[PDB]
Amino acid sequence: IICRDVARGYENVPIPCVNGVDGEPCPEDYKYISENCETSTMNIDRNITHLQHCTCVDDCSSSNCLCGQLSIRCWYDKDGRLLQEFNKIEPPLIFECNQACSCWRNCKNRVVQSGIKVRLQLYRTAKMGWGVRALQTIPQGTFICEYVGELISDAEADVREDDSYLFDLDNGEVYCIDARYYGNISRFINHLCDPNIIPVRVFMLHQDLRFPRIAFFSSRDIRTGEELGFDYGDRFWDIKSKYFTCQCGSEKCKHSAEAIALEQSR
Amino acid sequence: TEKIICRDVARGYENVPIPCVNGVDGEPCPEDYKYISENCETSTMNIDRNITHLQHCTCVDDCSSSNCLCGQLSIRCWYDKDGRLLQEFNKIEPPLIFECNQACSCWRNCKNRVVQSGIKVRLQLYRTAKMGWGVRALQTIPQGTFICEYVGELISDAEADVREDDSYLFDLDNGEVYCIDARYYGNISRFINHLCDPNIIPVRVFMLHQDLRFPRIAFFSSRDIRTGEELGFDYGDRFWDIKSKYFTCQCGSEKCKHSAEAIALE
Numbered sequence: 001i002i003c004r005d006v007a008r009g010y011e012n013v014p015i016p017c018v019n020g021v022d023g024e025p026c027p028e029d030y031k032y033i034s035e036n037c038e039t040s041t042m043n044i045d046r047n048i049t050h051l052q053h054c055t056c057v058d059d060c061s062s063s064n065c066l067c068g069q070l071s072i073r074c075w076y077d078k079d080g081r082l083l084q085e086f087n088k089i090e091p092p093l094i095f096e097c098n099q100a101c102s103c104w105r106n107c108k109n110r111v112v113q114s115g116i117k118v119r120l121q122l123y124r125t126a127k128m129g130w131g132v133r134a135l136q137t138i139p140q141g142t143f144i145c146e147y148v149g150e151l152i153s154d155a156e157a158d159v160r161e162d163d164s165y166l167f168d169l170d171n172g173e174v175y176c177i178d179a180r181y182y183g184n185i186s187r188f189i190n191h192l193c194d195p196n197i198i199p200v201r202v203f204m205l206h207q208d209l210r211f212p213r214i215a216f217f218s219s220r221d222i223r224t225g226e227e228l229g230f231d232y233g234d235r236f237w238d239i240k241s242k243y244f245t246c247q248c249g250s251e252k253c254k255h256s257a258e259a260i261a262l263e264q265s266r
Numbered sequence: 267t268e269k270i271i272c273r274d275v276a277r278g279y280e281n282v283p284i285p286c287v288n289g290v291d292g293e294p295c296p297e298d299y300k301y302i303s304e305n306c307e308t309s310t311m312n313i314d315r316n317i318t319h320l321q322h323c324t325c326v327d328d329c330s331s332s333n334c335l336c337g338q339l340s341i342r343c344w345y346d347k348d349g350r351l352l353q354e355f356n357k358i359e360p361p362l363i364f365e366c367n368q369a370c371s372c373w374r375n376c377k378n379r380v381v382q383s384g385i386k387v388r389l390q391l392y393r394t395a396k397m398g399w400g401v402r403a404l405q406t407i408p409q410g411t412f413i414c415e416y417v418g419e420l421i422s423d424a425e426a427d428v429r430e431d432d433s434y435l436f437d438l439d440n441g442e443v444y445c446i447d448a449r450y451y452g453n454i455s456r457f458i459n460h461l462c463d464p465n466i467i468p469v470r471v472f473m474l475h476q477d478l479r480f481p482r483i484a485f486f487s488s489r490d491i492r493t494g495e496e497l498g499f500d501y502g503d504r505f506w507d508i509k510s511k512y513f514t515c516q517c518g519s520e521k522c523k524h525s526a527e528a529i530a531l532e
């Protein structure tokens with residue numbers, strides 16, 4: 001219980017920091033930001049007239065909502081949680097309602113843009129450094145947080161010393177997000193071979209497809225105190241395996257030293 | 267008699283609802299515009315959003331000390347303990363206000379973040395006797411209270427020349443000159459009328475960026491405002507030299523400088 005809010009009041013709820021494992025102080029070699037930033041011109045298309053929008057006069061719960069149609073359908077239920085029909089392995093693009101829509105700010109297609117609602121905690125793990133865990137039970141499909149950081153080109157990523165906080169934004173031109181120097185609570189979520197949250201690309205106040213915003217949703221019910229983690233992917237582990245191995249301790253672990261040694265012996 | 271025609275013309279985008287009533291005639295709620303709570307662009311403005319270009323404070327307090335760089339850029343911080351402008355504030359020639367930003371080390375609740383926190387007072391869009399639609403107070407507003415931001419579409423000075431309707435223009439006189447046009451896109455401030463005895467004053471504020479070409483316009487009450495009193499500021503003589511040949515001022519004040527009487531009498 002060393003810092004009551006690492007977000008300095010920038011989020012909807014505080015995010016405290018605790019360490020009950022070692023003597024490492026709550027980390028401060030970064031700059032907490034709640035929204036994405038840029039350190040050089042990104043030229044995001046912010047033209048309000050280029051936004052696809054809906055004409056709904058209800059709460060956008062009908063199948064006629066265009067923004068829902070943009071995302072095949074609206075995948076948020078009445079409580080703002082992803083339907084279990086959601087393709088959790090290959091998620092679609094989610095187009096939330098925006099400032100050009102005729103609907104109200106409280107419509108059913110505005111989950112990610114409303115911010116963090118669940119209670120999270122920055123805590124010291126036993127073998128992974130810092131991690132994030134739930135201070136409450138989280139039902140499946142609930143929005144957790146956004147991967148927030150410094151928008152950079154992939155040419156700039158090629159000269160970055162530390163690539164441990166990078167999120168690729170595939171789409172022509174390639175961009176990505178770096179949470180090394182600027183980032184939010186998501187920069188502390190570790191890899192898990194049995195993940196409980198998944199990343200989804202979402203569009204809100206703009207629709208420039210080069211800059212999708214990364215939202216994390218729970219892939220299953222999560223108990224209190226349970227660590228949150230998503231699948232970092234093979235690109236991360238083909239690179240970092242030579243310096244360290246995965247410590248998630250799951251019987252399904254693909255990137256442990258024992259797992260790597262088992263299949264590279266065939 | 268007076269009918270309530272809209273519960274909230276902002277449709278839930280502001281901190282508080284802004285209702286629309288009419289007890290004068292049968293004009294329905296205005297809908298020849300798109301309500302937006304924040305400024306928009308229809309053509310690229312190329313605002314400098316580089317986070318490293320942000321002058322910021324290293325304050326570990328609530329930014330009330332004389333060492334806050336952000337307050338120093340406005341000579342001093344002009345907000346009192348409650349977020350109201352000091353009475354010594356230059357109401358004739360307001361200085362540029364630099365509120366604390368995302369690069370500052372302070373918390374989101376520091377004393378230098380009044381305008382970026384949104385509308386707090388209760389306003390109402392109503393039908394005036396002779397001035398079309400207006401905005402009035404539903405409470406008492408002490409002197410120096412932040413009222414609302416003049417929100418609209420950011421355009422160049424050349425674009426304003428080719429605009430059919432120049433009744434909703436606010437000029438940002440910097441270097442390169444730009445304007446806020448609330449004709450097609452605007453918020454509650456687009457309904458504030460001119461008063462020869464004004465009770466609010468515009469102040470130019472910088473928040474998440476510090477591009478001097480694009481200051482944000484904040485209305486603060488220039489003195490105590492009684493409940494039911496209409497809100498208004500001095501449009502300036504550029505507006506009136508253009509409009510006085512098409513219509514006259516109906517503020518009905520003992521001090522009117524733009525009525526057909528006052529104009530002809532000199």
Ligand SMILES: *CCC(=O)Nc1nc(NC2CCN(C(C)C)CC2)c2cc(OC)c(OCCCN3CCCC3)cc2n1
Binds near residue numbers: 162177
């Ligand atoms: C933006 C385009 C892109 O894919 N960038 C990128 N690069 C790397 N690897 C290196 C390559 C060269 N390095 C030096 C020689 C300069 C710099 C970067 C990269 C590596 C990753 O894993 C180590 C990585 O990851 C993917 C996501 C993992 N999680 C996501 C959230 C946090 C980490 C991404 C990488 N991207």
Ligand SMILES: C=CC(=O)Nc1nc(NC2CCN(C(C)C)CC2)c2cc(OC)c(OCCCN3CCCC3)cc2n1
Binds near residue numbers: 424437444506
């Ligand atoms: C430097 C760029 C720039 O600001 N330009 C510009 N242009 C105008 N009209 C042109 C339109 C046509 N054109 C010819 C070439 C036809 C020449 C005149 C303006 C008119 C204004 O009121 C009439 C005005 O009032 C501002 C205050 C008024 N209230 C309204 C609510 C808020 C403030 C400002 C105007 N500013």
Ligand SMILES: C[S@@+](CC[C@H](N)C(=O)[O-])C[C@H]1O[C@@H](n2cnc3c(N)ncnc32)[C@H](O)[C@@H]1O
Binds near residue numbers: 128131188189247248
């Ligand atoms: C995005 S950061 C996550 C936060 C990080 N653990 C910290 O303390 O700052 C990713 C880094 O955390 C560590 N990490 C994440 N997942 C891991 C895992 N499953 N096993 C071992 N280390 C992991 C690795 O060092 C990796 O470089």
Ligand SMILES: C[S@@+](CC[C@H](N)C(=O)[O-])C[C@H]1O[C@@H](n2cnc3c(N)ncnc32)[C@H](O)[C@@H]1O
Binds near residue numbers: 399456513515517
């Ligand atoms: C920014 S709009 C204000 C809202 C306007 N009353 C409406 O109904 O939409 C400015 C226009 O309102 C009218 N107006 C504003 N102040 C006025 C005044 N003091 N006397 C007469 N008309 C005024 C003028 O027609 C002017 O072009």
Ligand SMILES: [Zn+2]
Binds near residue numbers: 056060066103
């Ligand atoms: Zn809709």
Ligand SMILES: [Zn+2]
Binds near residue numbers: 056103107
């Ligand atoms: Zn909607």
Ligand SMILES: [Zn+2]
Binds near residue numbers: 097
């Ligand atoms: Zn919509």
Ligand SMILES: [Zn+2]
Binds near residue numbers: 252256
């Ligand atoms: Zn593992």
Ligand SMILES: [Zn+2]
Binds near residue numbers: 323328329336337366
């Ligand atoms: Zn400060």
Ligand SMILES: [Zn+2]
Binds near residue numbers: 325328366373377378
């Ligand atoms: Zn501050």
Ligand SMILES: [Zn+2]
Binds near residue numbers: 324371372378
């Ligand atoms: Zn500051």
Ligand SMILES: [Zn+2]
Binds near residue numbers: 522523525
């Ligand atoms: Zn007058």
